[PDB]
Design an enzyme around this catalytic site. Structure first.
Site: not given
Ligand SMILES: CC(C)Cc1ccc([C@@H](C)C(=O)SCCNC(=O)CCNC(=O)[C@H](O)C(C)(C)COP(=O)(O)OP(=O)(O)OC[C@H]2O[C@@H]([n+]3c[nH]c4c(N)ncnc43)[C@H](O)[C@@H]2OP(=O)(O)O)cc1
Ligand SMILES: CC(C)Cc1ccc([C@H](C)C(=O)SCCNC(=O)CCNC(=O)[C@H](O)C(C)(C)COP(=O)(O)OP(=O)(O)OC[C@H]2O[C@@H]([n+]3c[nH]c4c(N)ncnc43)[C@H](O)[C@@H]2OP(=O)(O)O)cc1
Lengths: 354, 354
Positions: B120, B150
């Site tokens: 994050h 972010d």
């Molecule tokens: C409670 C919060 C909302 C509040 C909040 C807000 C903001 C923050 C700040 C601090 C942040 O930094 S949030 C941003 C975090 N990081 C990033 O975005 C960097 C890039 N992202 C990532 O590395 C990851 O997405 C991560 C955020 C770490 C989460 O990891 P993850 O394993 O849960 O997800 P992932 O991206 O690896 O894989 C996604 C998964 O979902 C599936 N998916 C997607 N869309 C759909 C759909 N429409 N129908 C069916 N399936 C779907 C995909 O197939 C995928 O599965 P797979 O098995 O292929 O890995 C923190 C909290």
């Protein structure tokens, strides 16, 4: 070599956001010409040509207008009214170039009770609730450098405004004026907190929220050597990976999100992280999803493998500087050209055909 | 009816930087369709159409691709490889629409030792020197919310990438992939400090620099009522105005920029500001170039005249939200449309003629 190759920008020498926005355009391939009053060691002034002109003089106004006559974009960051009194205001520019994106970078905006008032980043963010929310709960707010006002909510919004207006121009055939005020850009920058405030998910209490250092699982910890790690293990599975690495038994701790016991949780984690060096933890959590990372000082950044591998920095004369961002698969940007000698404005005019 | 009216954006539902980028596009007039997994009170989801689909299924993938073939932009924020495995990767999308701007929003980037690792905001800024630089010198680093990773070095760089690529598209008639890594954007966000470190104008010592709270003339001060003002009086004449409003004789103070005597200067200023309430200082300055401003909590912001007059905020239901930024003189943005009920995906495709 980047996506903005072809784009001509006039930049009127200013401080802070203005030059930062101009730098990012240059970064991405724009032809930026900066007009200064009559060889640089500010890396920020990479990717320009620098010319010089007294804008208070007849000859200087006339040359700047000839240069503007051939530009796509003009960046100015003076008090409102300043370019007007100079004769380089938007209405004067339209007479020579109605395709011009006239980008005006200010803290308070073009209008309003505070628009003639001097200020800096810390001021613009103090008036919109942002500064109040940064820092530990037990003490006065701390400025997040000038990252939020000048840059994140500043130059970044000027850039969006500029590039958005160029999109508009593909159908209108015309420019317009972009009024980018740091007090605005920074509020949209923090829209997530405004959204969360309305649904009970953020409070006005400094240091007592999910993302401000209030949560024991979203904060830095001091390690055995006085150095720090950042913990950002928001999701339960990442949090679990975090405990395991620390050698803590989950069943012995308070629940991750029992805020009532957050002091107890934080105290146990503090003790754990303090038991070894920062580099130890970086080794423990090297490939894990524990969201645990070493807090690197600027001087150390250049030795981190993910930083190295991806060439996030280049070495530019007496120090590392960030490579352009973001990245483009087909029209990739060049390594920034260093600040150089000032050159003859007429030569720029000749080049541009003015 | 902002400047991006006409732009078609498919947003694959995510968290943090992705939705924020999509929000800003929609704020400025873009037609944004967000595909969610099968009416919101996240005001962040303003200015959308929401449709739902199972991207893992044969049918959901088929429709998503039909949507994408009719779009200008695709936003995704998953781990590298995720869209690839879904059949919505850049190479698959290219086959249906080679004009598509494929915008990939991550913290670590598409490649590198950390590209598959969870994280994050706090993690990304811990690795590039930023977080180390934030907070008081006598304490562990404090996170500046998720403003820098972010948003400032995140969504904002995605946005600049999106719009830069659209500019390039005018000439090439083709799109490309935008790799927007928070670790990169935030480094360019902080380029000023990288520049300054090279010329001895910034140190890695936390809380002891010009813009980090180190300077008595660039920091907050607590007032008699326990609230705070921000002082930003960098220039001599602003500093001079600041002292005049305090009733301090400059002849009796240490020089503004004698760092050796900063503790002494800060004690004098601390004593002064502590003598009256924030709103007294509020009133004593309020009008001047002293760069002194009250530190307003979110809840107080809607009462500040400058905030009010310029309509920086609007009341959504149950609370204030930021109006679009920046501002455009000819194609002004609308007040954001609130989150609405999910729309039927076939109905969007009908609309787009997909
Ligand atoms: C409670 C919060 C909302 C509040 C909040 C807000 C903001 C923050 C700040 C601090 C942040 O930094 S949030 C941003 C975090 N990081 C990033 O975005 C960097 C890039 N992202 C990532 O590395 C990851 O997405 C991560 C955020 C770490 C989460 O990891 P993850 O394993 O849960 O997800 P992932 O991206 O690896 O894989 C996604 C998964 O979902 C599936 N998916 C997607 N869309 C759909 C759909 N429409 N129908 C069916 N399936 C779907 C995909 O197939 C995928 O599965 P797979 O098995 O292929 O890995 C923190 C909290
Ligand atoms: C660390 C260093 C390296 C960089 C740095 C970065 C960031 C920061 C901090 C944190 C910041 O926030 S910087 C940004 C601060 N705020 C803004 O930019 C908001 C808009 N700006 C302003 O309100 C003001 O310009 C302000 C910054 C407050 C300074 O006030 P000011 O009175 O000095 O400036 P002003 O705009 O009223 O006057 C401009 C003045 O310049 C003149 N000018 C321009 N070009 C030329 C030329 N080529 N030849 C002759 N004259 C020229 C104009 O005529 C004008 O004079 P005028 O007669 O109108 O007073 C500080 C420093």
């Amino acid at each position: 070599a980047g996506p903005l190759s072809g784009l001509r920008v006039v930049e009127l020498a200013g401080i802070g956001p203005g030059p930062h926005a101009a730098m990012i355009l240059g970064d991405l391939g724009a032809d930026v010409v900066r007009i200064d009053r009559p060889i640089s060691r500010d890396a920020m002034l990479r990717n320009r040509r620098i010319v010089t002109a007294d804008l208070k003089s007849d000859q200087g106004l006339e040359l700047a207008l000839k240069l503007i006559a051939k530009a796509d974009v003009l960046i100015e960051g003076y008090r409102p009214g300043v370019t007007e009194r100079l004769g380089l205001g938007p209405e004067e520019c339209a007479k020579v170039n109605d395709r011009l994106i006239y980008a005006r970078m200010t803290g308070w905006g073009q209008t309003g009770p505070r628009s003639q008032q001097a200020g800096h980043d810390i001021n613009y963010i103090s008036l919109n609730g942002i500064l109040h929310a940064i820092g530990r709960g037990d003490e006065r707010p701390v400025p997040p450098l000038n990252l939020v006002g000048d840059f994140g909510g500043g130059s970044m919004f000027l850039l969006v405004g500029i590039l958005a207006a160029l999109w508009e121009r593909q159908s209108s055939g015309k420019g317009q004026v972009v009024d980018a005020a740091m007090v605005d850009g920074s509020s949209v920058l923090i829209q997530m907190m405004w959204a969360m405030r309305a649904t009970g998910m953020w409070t006005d209490t400094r240091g007592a929220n999910m993302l401000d250092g209030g949560a024991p699982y979203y904060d830095t910890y001091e390690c055995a050597d006085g150095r720090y790690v950042a913990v950002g293990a928001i999701e339960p599975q990442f949090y679990a990976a975090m405990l395991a690495g620390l050698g803590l038994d989950a069943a012995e701790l308070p629940p991750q999100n029992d805020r009532a016991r957050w002091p107890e949780l934080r105290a146990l984690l503090t003790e754990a992280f303090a038991s070894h060096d920062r580099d130890h933890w970086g080794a423990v959590f090297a490939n894990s999803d524990a969201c645990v990372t070493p807090v690197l000082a600027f001087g150390e950044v250049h030795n981190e493998p993910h930083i190295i591998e991806r060439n996030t920095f280049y070495e530019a004369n007496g120090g590392w500087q960030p490579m352009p961002a973001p990245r483009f698969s087909r029209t990739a940007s060049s390594q920034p050209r260093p600040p150089a000698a000032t050159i003859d404005i007429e030569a720029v005019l000749t080049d541009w055909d003015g």
